[PDB]
Amino acid sequence: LRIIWGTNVSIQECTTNFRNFLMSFKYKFRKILDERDEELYYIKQLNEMRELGTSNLNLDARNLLAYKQTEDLYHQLLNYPQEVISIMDQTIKDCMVSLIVDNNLDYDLDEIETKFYKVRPYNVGSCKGMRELNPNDIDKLINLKGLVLRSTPVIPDMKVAFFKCNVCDHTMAVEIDRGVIQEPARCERIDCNEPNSMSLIHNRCSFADKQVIKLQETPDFVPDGQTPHSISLCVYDELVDSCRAGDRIEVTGTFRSIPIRANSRQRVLKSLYKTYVDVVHVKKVSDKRLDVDTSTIEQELMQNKVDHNEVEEVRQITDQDLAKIREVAAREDLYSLLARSIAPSIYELEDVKKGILLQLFGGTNKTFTKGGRYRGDINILLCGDPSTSKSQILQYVHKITPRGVYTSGKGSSAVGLTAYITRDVDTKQLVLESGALVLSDGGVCCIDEFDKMSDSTRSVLHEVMEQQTISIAKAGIITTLNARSSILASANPIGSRYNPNLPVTENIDLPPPLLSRFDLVYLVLDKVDEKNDRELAKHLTNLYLEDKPEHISQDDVLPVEFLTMYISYAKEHIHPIITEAAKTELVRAYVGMRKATTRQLESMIRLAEAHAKMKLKNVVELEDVQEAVRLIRSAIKDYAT
Amino acid sequence: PPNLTRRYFLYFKPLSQNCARRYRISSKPLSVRQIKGDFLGQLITVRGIITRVSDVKPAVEVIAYTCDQCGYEVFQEVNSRTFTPLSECTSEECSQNQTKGQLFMSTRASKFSAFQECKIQELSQQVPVGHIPRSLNIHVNGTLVRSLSPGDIVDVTGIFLPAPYTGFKALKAGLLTETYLEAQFVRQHKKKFASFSLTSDVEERVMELITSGDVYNRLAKSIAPEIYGNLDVKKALLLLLVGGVDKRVGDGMKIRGDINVCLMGDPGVAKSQLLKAICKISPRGVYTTGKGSSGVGLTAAVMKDPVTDEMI
Amino acid sequence: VDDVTGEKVREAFEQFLEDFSVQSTDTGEVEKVYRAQIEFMKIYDLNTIYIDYQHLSMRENGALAMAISEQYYRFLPFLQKGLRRVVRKYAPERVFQISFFNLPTVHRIRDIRSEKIGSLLSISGTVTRTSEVRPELYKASFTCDMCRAIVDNVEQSFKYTEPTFCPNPSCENRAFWTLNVTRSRFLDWQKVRIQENANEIPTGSMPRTLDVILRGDSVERAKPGDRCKFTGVEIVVPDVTQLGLPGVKPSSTLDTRGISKTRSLGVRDLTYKISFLACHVISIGSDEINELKEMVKDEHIYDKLVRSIAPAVFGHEAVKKGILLQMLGGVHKSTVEGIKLRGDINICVVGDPSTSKSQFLKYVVGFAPRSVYTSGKASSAAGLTAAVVRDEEGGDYTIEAGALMLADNGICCIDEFDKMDISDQVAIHEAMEQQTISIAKAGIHATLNARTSILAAANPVGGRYNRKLSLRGNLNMTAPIMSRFDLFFVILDDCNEKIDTELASHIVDLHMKRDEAIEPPFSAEQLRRYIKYARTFKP
Numbered sequence A: 001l002r003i004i005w006g007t008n009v010s011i012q013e014c015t016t017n018f019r020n021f022l023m024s025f026k027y028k029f030r031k032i033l034d035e036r037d038e039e040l041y042y043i044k045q046l047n048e049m050r051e052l053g054t055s056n057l058n059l060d061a062r063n064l065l066a067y068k069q070t071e072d073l074y075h076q077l078l079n080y081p082q083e084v085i086s087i088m089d090q091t092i093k094d095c096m097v098s099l100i101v102d103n104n105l106d107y108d109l110d111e112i113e114t115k116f117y118k119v120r121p122y123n124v125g126s127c128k129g130m131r132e133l134n135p136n137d138i139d140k141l142i143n144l145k146g147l148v149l150r151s152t153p154v155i156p157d158m159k160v161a162f163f164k165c166n167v168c169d170h171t172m173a174v175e176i177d178r179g180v181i182q183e184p185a186r187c188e189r190i191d192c193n194e195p196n197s198m199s200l201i202h203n204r205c206s207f208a209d210k211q212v213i214k215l216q217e218t219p220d221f222v223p224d225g226q227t228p229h230s231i232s233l234c235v236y237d238e239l240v241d242s243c244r245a246g247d248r249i250e251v252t253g254t255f256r257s258i259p260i261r262a263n264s265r266q267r268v269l270k271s272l273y274k275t276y277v278d279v280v281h282v283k284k285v286s287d288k289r290l291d292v293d294t295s296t297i298e299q300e301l302m303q304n305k306v307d308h309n310e311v312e313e314v315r316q317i318t319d320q321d322l323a324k325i326r327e328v329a330a331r332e333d334l335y336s337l338l339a340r341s342i343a344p345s346i347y348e349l350e351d352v353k354k355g356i357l358l359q360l361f362g363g364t365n366k367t368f369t370k371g372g373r374y375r376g377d378i379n380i381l382l383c384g385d386p387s388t389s390k391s392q393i394l395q396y397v398h399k400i401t402p403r404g405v406y407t408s409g410k411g412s413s414a415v416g417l418t419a420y421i422t423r424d425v426d427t428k429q430l431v432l433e434s435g436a437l438v439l440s441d442g443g444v445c446c447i448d449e450f451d452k453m454s455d456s457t458r459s460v461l462h463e464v465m466e467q468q469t470i471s472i473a474k475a476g477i478i479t480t481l482n483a484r485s486s487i488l489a490s491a492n493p494i495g496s497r498y499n500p501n502l503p504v505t506e507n508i509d510l511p512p513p514l515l516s517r518f519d520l521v522y523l524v525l526d527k528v529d530e531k532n533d534r535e536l537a538k539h540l541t542n543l544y545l546e547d548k549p550e551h552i553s554q555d556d557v558l559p560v561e562f563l564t565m566y567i568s569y570a571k572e573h574i575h576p577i578i579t580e581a582a583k584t585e586l587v588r589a590y591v592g593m594r595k596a597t598t599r600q601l602e603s604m605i606r607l608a609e610a611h612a613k614m615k616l617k618n619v620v621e622l623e624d625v626q627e628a629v630r631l632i633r634s635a636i637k638d639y640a641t
Numbered sequence B: 001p002p003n004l005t006r007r008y009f010l011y012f013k014p015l016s017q018n019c020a021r022r023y024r025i026s027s028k029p030l031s032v033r034q035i036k037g038d039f040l041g042q043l044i045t046v047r048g049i050i051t052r053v054s055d056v057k058p059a060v061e062v063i064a065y066t067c068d069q070c071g072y073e074v075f076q077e078v079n080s081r082t083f084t085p086l087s088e089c090t091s092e093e094c095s096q097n098q099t100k101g102q103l104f105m106s107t108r109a110s111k112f113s114a115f116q117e118c119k120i121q122e123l124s125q126q127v128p129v130g131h132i133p134r135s136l137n138i139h140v141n142g143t144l145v146r147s148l149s150p151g152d153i154v155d156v157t158g159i160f161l162p163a164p165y166t167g168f169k170a171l172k173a174g175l176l177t178e179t180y181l182e183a184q185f186v187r188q189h190k191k192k193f194a195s196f197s198l199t200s201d202v203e204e205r206v207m208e209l210i211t212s213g214d215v216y217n218r219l220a221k222s223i224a225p226e227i228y229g230n231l232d233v234k235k236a237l238l239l240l241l242v243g244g245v246d247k248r249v250g251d252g253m254k255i256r257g258d259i260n261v262c263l264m265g266d267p268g269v270a271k272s273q274l275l276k277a278i279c280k281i282s283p284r285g286v287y288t289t290g291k292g293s294s295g296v297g298l299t300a301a302v303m304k305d306p307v308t309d310e311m312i
Numbered sequence C: 001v002d003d004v005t006g007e008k009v010r011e012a013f014e015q016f017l018e019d020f021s022v023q024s025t026d027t028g029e030v031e032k033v034y035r036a037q038i039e040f041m042k043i044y045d046l047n048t049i050y051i052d053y054q055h056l057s058m059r060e061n062g063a064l065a066m067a068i069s070e071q072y073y074r075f076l077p078f079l080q081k082g083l084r085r086v087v088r089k090y091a092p093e094r095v096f097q098i099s100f101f102n103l104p105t106v107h108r109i110r111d112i113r114s115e116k117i118g119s120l121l122s123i124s125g126t127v128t129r130t131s132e133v134r135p136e137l138y139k140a141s142f143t144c145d146m147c148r149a150i151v152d153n154v155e156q157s158f159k160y161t162e163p164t165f166c167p168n169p170s171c172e173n174r175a176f177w178t179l180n181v182t183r184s185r186f187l188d189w190q191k192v193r194i195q196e197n198a199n200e201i202p203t204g205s206m207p208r209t210l211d212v213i214l215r216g217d218s219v220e221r222a223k224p225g226d227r228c229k230f231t232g233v234e235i236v237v238p239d240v241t242q243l244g245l246p247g248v249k250p251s252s253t254l255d256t257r258g259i260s261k262t263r264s265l266g267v268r269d270l271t272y273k274i275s276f277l278a279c280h281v282i283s284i285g286s287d288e289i290n291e292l293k294e295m296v297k298d299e300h301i302y303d304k305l306v307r308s309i310a311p312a313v314f315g316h317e318a319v320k321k322g323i324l325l326q327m328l329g330g331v332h333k334s335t336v337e338g339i340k341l342r343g344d345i346n347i348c349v350v351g352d353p354s355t356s357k358s359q360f361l362k363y364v365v366g367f368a369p370r371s372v373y374t375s376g377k378a379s380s381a382a383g384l385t386a387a388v389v390r391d392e393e394g395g396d397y398t399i400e401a402g403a404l405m406l407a408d409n410g411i412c413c414i415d416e417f418d419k420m421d422i423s424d425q426v427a428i429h430e431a432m433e434q435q436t437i438s439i440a441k442a443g444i445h446a447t448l449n450a451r452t453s454i455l456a457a458a459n460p461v462g463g464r465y466n467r468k469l470s471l472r473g474n475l476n477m478t479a480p481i482m483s484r485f486d487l488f489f490v491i492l493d494d495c496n497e498k499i500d501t502e503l504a505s506h507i508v509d510l511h512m513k514r515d516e517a518i519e520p521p522f523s524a525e526q527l528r529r530y531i532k533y534a535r536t537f538k539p
């Protein structure tokens, strides 16, 4: 028997069971979890990784839940994660060199013995936010889901306590002991004995890296009377410059406690321990929504490369699904099936939904040698009767888009949109907070009730609709930043119940230029008649007929996943350069439609090039201009007046 | 000490006077204002309303200090807000030792139990004439921290107790005390919706209720009979209380089973008896005026918290 | 361990220095001038040498440098010593400075971790402040508390507090000491506050900043509001700001084990920030005579210079002309009383939206030497003009580098003019009336000077400019601010199909990546030098 004090954790038995589970795991969870070819799920990781020289690895919880001999390991890595991982980092090197025994190799063995190893349990048992952590369950592997507000700078920490003796041309050295230093006062008695003569230098010593992150908590359930909390934590080195503002996150870590000082003056402390979280792994992406522009973030990619930390930045693909995509694109009912699939719970709204999807393609992101940039974003407006799915559409897009914020009515101001400055409650120092405009930099910026908004708040969007650049000049802060988000929002009519026979470029309670510069608008008038109403009636009732609408899957609808991944590969790998035929159909379209300004030109091109991105063309074509100008005149309903 | 061998908190609750009158008191529902000084720590029941409670958080009761060299433990005890740690080795083997190898602490062996505060405010009908009512604090620990949420009738029970403050060191004469009370039990005449479970009598209540029949219009009759007629609107309020049915799309959306109602009409006819009966009976209820503090008081605040530095 | 190493480094390095001499004969074999470098230095007794990294890391395959660059400070005292030897060797009251410029690598501030400590490492960033010259404790005497026995030595970097040894040790407590001021050596100081640059930044981001400190004669080469490329070593310093933070906190304590029977623990808390130092910094961000001699000889080069300054934008020649004379300043001196003029000129334009006004801003801020784009609205004048510190970090206050204080000999391109506040236009008026400013807060008074030449952006009331009314009823900005303006412009459109078609052609051709549509007479390069010639011609 071997065992730890206050503990039921064996080292070598854990190593053996680890190794046996490791040699034995072959998509077991497909079998035991569910009904769902391959072989030895895990082992391929450990065969591949060696030649690339990396000291990391990821790991599920379920594969322990699936394999026989790992059910007790689950509750033990759970309770003693840093201890169980101080084991497994050794068991892993053990399994490594127990697996190399069956191989003869060029002399790479100068390194692996000098190497370290570490693990990252990510997809784990769910936890309900923060309130659950009454003190019974502190210091345990934990999972969470939320987004980012504020990032600190780097905390260093003594990691090698260098020490300069004053005499005898001698240095000295000593390391950290559960997080302290006990300076050796003496002077190395043999050579010289001066029992408190020694000095300290920083430039010698070894420093750690630590960072702290403010986070907003976004549960799935809340109690009666709930509201946000803002939590701090600690990440450590090799994870730096990963998670920042503008990201939703699923995460893991360990909940813990700590006291603080009463002052900078003495050691008298608080009865109540400030809580926090130490970090184990972060999940930057997920399945139910697409990901960042791959062009936007290049410097961060090459940085993570240089740093040899490779926690994900972009979802990865399979070739069989690439072929699946080239198959699904061969058919011609794309242009409608995308539409029918965006919103099965809703009636037709064809052009509306198509425009939503074309903005989700976005468009073109070109730059100039030094003095140009033209971004893939087309600002969108809606208008018409209430009592439709305008608001529903908008909630839907705000969910499904990764990087975006929602605004409503007149409860907003320029201060809470561009930069604002504030103070921390712990450090009591002057630290900033990013603005809801810039948070969506790349993605969605959603609004409702655009009309009643203050003219102070409505004044800023003059420039954001052009350059994706806000500027600030206020206290101790001067910097023109970038806000590549797109705009997508509702308007409400002049008065109530409409005025069919009037220039609707005047019938809004909104002036011309603000409205003309929108790349496109959509219209929601009623036109009451059956053949559009009864059908919608059953369309929305049969939703309620079921506990949840799965039998809405009829009438040819896709799933979200193949869709979204097709979209992501599309967004990330094609560049349609503009063609010559489309010129002569675009120019005449614009000019003849002028009978109301030059921005709808930019609208047509930025949307037709997205039409080109769709179908997976690496080229635009004359035909895209056709549906472009067509659906434009269908949008504002050219025929009536 | 024996305190770290305790796997059990205790939380009292006092009698309901219905039983004290059986065989024949001590603690009646009392005020923020009617303490009378001498009631420090005596057994008590206060009513009122909770404005703001902070979030639950942990707090030591007993330290776990272990020795580097002796390999033995030390039990440093605190009951104050504060203490000063124990660094030099006063151990029992180091007592009979020249060298005094340093000790340190634990993060798991060291006992813990939470600590959360709450503020009552006084009930209207018991404020005397023309008088601005006043405030009070309570301290809670551990288990019952989750039975409190602002905006409710309550009967806190426990004991009113002192603590070390003297004002602020100029307007003083000595021996002065800031103070607090102990939480041990919560009853509230308002039963929230998530405390529902049937039994062998309340199911009987629902039975004999439904047995009579005409149940729908009977309800909408019993809604605020103080005011006359208009059963059609009493019924509409009843349906507002029902809310509807929640349905989920399973595609990244749901839709509310929720209601929104209005009663346009001229003056003279009764209007407000309705809303007051509503917030009288419905829990999680709220009244506002039209103008005044409508700017932000319908909206989210920003505030620092008393008992802990945090932006709530 | 480097008691053995560092002197070998000294020997190898002074050998490197001496074995190289002034070669480059006929611009051929470069041999390294460090011998004549310190010669020409001793001419003036500046003691403040430069080093190149390249000509160092050639010899010995650079493996010398590979480890030196990480373990600099360990060998640095020995580095300076060999120089002193070489100076003693080949030249006949001495303190010194050193710097290494033209490093290959750049690291942003985010690209700096805890393994570059004591490491030379080149960063570039931006400035928002300077601070006060305060001469620094290089050497300084002390004296016995029981005799006149002086000690002319110093613990220098930190640990600036206490020597031990006395010449006549017979003392009851030789542990502590006295002091003195004059038998001492000092050297200048300076502090700035260093800042991110825009063209390298992330999302959800603030320009994360931090402090850097100077030394020696290389000071006065700082500047506010400009990009710079620093080089020095990862100096750090204590802090307590980092309190209230999670997890566990290091703490120092002397040992009480192996010796016994001798806050009594003498415990200090230790927690630090990562500042930086600079060995040297530079201001980032000929046949030209023949170039400009050829360009000038034309006559319509006026029209060329006109049309070449916004090929990104289409037409509106007046904008081009006005902006091309805006940088050009008027002689503010032509008086006798000493009552003076606002020699420069000022601008604005009007036009409905769906117009290319902001293109001009983005142009000139993308061209200008000195400039800034800002809100127009989302700003207090405490942001435009300078709100300053009140006696923080112990030392005295320092005027903040004002935003509108900027544009000395230049421009403050400001959009969104109409939605300005009450007090900001007030302050602007005060800025325009004279070419001077007055400021105060906390009793402190200020006085500054500038000759700012604004171009900015009009936004009419409803946007629609009724062509049959006058300017004032539509502008909505009071008279004096509407006055002082040498110029107003208007840009308003109408149906012209022949020209609208070619305009849309230009626009859509611009969605051809970096096409040749902007083919000018010439580019920004020669333009900037042409400006620096022309600004000072004095007609």
Ligand SMILES: Nc1ncnc2c1ncn2[C@@H]1O[C@H](COP(=O)(O)OP(=O)(O)O)[C@@H](O)[C@H]1O
Pocket: B227, B228, B267, B268, B269, B270, B271, B272, B273
């Ligand atoms: N139908 C009624 N029966 C009895 N009392 C009524 C009736 N209508 C009005 N009242 C009395 O007149 C007052 C009407 O006030 P109310 O209509 O509720 O508020 P407001 O008039 O400000 O909207 C009430 O105090 C109520 O007692």
Ligand SMILES: [Zn+2]
Pocket: A165, A166, A167, A168, A169, A170, A187, A188, A191, A192
């Ligand atoms: Zn020594």
Ligand SMILES: [Zn+2]
Pocket: B067, B069, B070, B089, B090, B091, B092, B093, B094, B095, B100, B101
């Ligand atoms: Zn001991």
Ligand SMILES: [Zn+2]
Pocket: C144, C145, C146, C147, C149, C166, C167, C168, C169, C170, C171, C174
């Ligand atoms: Zn002496």
